């Protein structure tokens, strides 16, 4: 968020549940942190990516976006290490993931190579 006057570098941790595919984004609070202690940015829910092209004739002021109107859900496919991914207009570049995630991705999902990428400046 450097471009705005309120530049920040707060790190985030993103959880995806295999219960039903749900994503939550918790923040990493610092020592001083300048900020009120808050639990999470977003809560367990289903993110659409693109919805059915009949969205023009959908009264979004009355009915919510539902499984009839979406044609595709956020899945682990956008959730791959090394590549940025947008949620609600947030750039959210993935820095790294856990060893259990690396295992599961390599032996159950299929892609074997997800090397880490440093994101920290040299002071």
């Amino acid at each position: 968020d450097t471009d705005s006057l309120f530049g920040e570098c707060r790190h985030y941790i993103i959880h995806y549940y295999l219960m039903d595919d749900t994503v939550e984004i918790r923040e990493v609070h610092e020592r001083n942190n300048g900020r009120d202690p808050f639990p999470l940015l977003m809560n367990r829910q289903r993110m659409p990516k693109v919805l059915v092209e009949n969205a023009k004739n959908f009264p979004k002021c009355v009915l919510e976006i539902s499984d009839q109107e979406v044609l595709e859900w956020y899945t682990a496919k956008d959730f791959i290490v090394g590549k940025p991914l947008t949620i609600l207009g947030r750039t959210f570049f993935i820095y790294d993931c856990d060893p259990f995630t690396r295992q599961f991705y390599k032996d159950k999902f299929g892609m074997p190579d997800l090397p880490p990428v440093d994101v920290t400046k040299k002071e």
């Binding site: 450097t2 570098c9 400046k121």
Partner: peptide, 7 residues
């Protein structure tokens, strides 16, 4: 292609 790693 190039947007660095940024802090």
């Amino acid at each position: 292609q190039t947007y660095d790693v940024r802090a």
